[PDB]
Design a protein around this ligand. Structure first.
Ligand SMILES: [Ca+2]
Length: 420
């Protein structure tokens, strides 16, 4: 009884590399090869790997034995019958990599010293790592700072093309992004794809969206000439950019996005944030988290609930440190509204204010305030009030801000009592 110990090495073959855990391998037995005979030994020497395995799947010429992941640098398939085996690295490892090709392993083998049989065989397939893509958010329109509800966000996903084993090809190359639920569908005229800062043969690039529950997945897949020559673009970036509408305030204030890179072109619509053991494992991007806030106005009229015949109107603005309006400061628009009227209960809710974004910059997570450089705070200006009441003469400062630690909705309640 024999064993095959698979050690998954990260690095480039030549023609002591680090062993990697969580690399997934399936062991198959090669049918009808008896290496103790000349019939079988010579059949083994004629074998074309494409006969045993082709198009990402085994043929009927092999029988599956088991599948497992490396741990402590090894996936050991123990208690094996003497046979010719085929070791297949799979796409469902703990981390996404450019996987090893299928390869044959006889068990037992002769000890390299010649001194007897080697029952416990070791093999050392090489794979190449995928770098974590860098996802950022950009405000695509500067008319209003940020991307509060009612405006569009833009995302940029930069993926490095790894150097792969000489004379091998990428199996495929997919970048997928399951947009957060608060976003609408991406504008198809604003999805762009560049490789090495160059546009790609659009015939080779398949841009698709599909719904998975209440979220849109955007998928960019390289195929054809472009995929075939992608091994010549080592260390270049594939950059996907897109815009989408911010349609609602995240309930927890967090508008969070990640993308994923998969070195494969799945035939089924792939959800990169799918779960189980068989799931094709993508390499996740850096996270982007945009922070939102909400202002609630609680209006009273000489201490009373306003009721049916009293209402006030406010606009949201930015103010300088002295409480004065920023020069030429426009009213802030939220979900297409630019003023806010108090209800009979005195409430007015200003929701979906995008405050800023936490994203990777030079490999460090950094928060940027979307309103940086437009004053120092938000403020409310009362533009109308009830019959016989006096308007508030100055903006009402409202402290509403986020930072790198923000992980719930930022709120401020503003109690305002109107006076005769
Ligand atoms: Ca904007």
């Amino acid at each position: 009884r024999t064993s095959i110990a698979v050690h998954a090495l990260m690095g480039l073959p030549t023609g002591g590399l680090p062993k990697v855990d969580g690399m997934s391998f399936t062991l198959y037995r090669v049918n009808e090869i008896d290496l103790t005979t000349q019939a079988g030994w010579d059949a083994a020497s004629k074998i074309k790997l494409e006969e045993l395995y082709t198009n990402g799947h085994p043929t009927d010429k092999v029988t599956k034995v088991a599948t497992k992941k490396t741990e402590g640098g090894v996936a050991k398939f123990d208690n094996l019958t003497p046979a010719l085996y085929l070791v297949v690295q799979e796409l469902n490892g703990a981390e996404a990599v450019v996987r090893s090709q299928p390869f044959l392993v006889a068990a037992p083998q002769t000890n390299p010293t010649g001194d007897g049989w080697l029952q416990d065989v070791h093999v050392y397939p090489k794979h190449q790592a995928l770098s974590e893509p860098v996802k950022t958010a950009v405000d695509p329109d500067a008319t209003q700072p940020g991307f509060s509800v009612g405006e569009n966000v833009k995302y940029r996903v930069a993926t490095k093309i790894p150097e792969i084993a000489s004379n091998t090809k990428f199996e495929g190359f997919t970048v997928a992004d399951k947009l957060p639920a608060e976003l609408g569908k991406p504008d198809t005229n604003k999805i762009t794809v560049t490789l090495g800062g160059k546009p790609i043969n659009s015939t080779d690039v398949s841009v698709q969206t599909y719904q998975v529950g209440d979220r849109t997945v955007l998928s960019v897949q390289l195929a054809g000439a472009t995929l075939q020559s992608l091994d010549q673009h080592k260390d270049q970036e594939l950059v996907v950019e897109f815009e989408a509408p911010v349609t609602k305030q995240p309930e927890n204030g967090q508008l969070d996005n990640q993308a994923w890179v998969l070195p494969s072109n799945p035939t089924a619509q792939w959800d990169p944030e799918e779960s189980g053991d068989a799931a094709l494992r993508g390499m996740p991007s850096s996270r982007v988290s945009s922070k939102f806030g909400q202002i609630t106005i609680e209006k009273s009229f000489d201490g009373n609930t306003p009721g049916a015949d009293r209402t006030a109107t406010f606009q949201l603005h930015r103010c300088e440190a002295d409480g004065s309006l920023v020069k030429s400061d426009p009213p802030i628009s939220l979900d297409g509204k630019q003023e806010f009227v108090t209800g009979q209960d005195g409430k007015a809710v200003l929701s979906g204010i995008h405050l800023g974004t936490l994203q990777l910059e030079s490999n460090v997570m950094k928060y940027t305030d979307a309103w940086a450089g437009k004053g120092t705070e938000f403020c409310l200006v009362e533009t109308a009030t009830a019959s016989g009441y006096e308007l508030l003469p100055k903006p009402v400062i409202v402290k509403l801000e986020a930072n790198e630690s923000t992980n719930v909705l930022v709120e401020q309640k503003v109690k305002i009592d109107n006076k005769k």
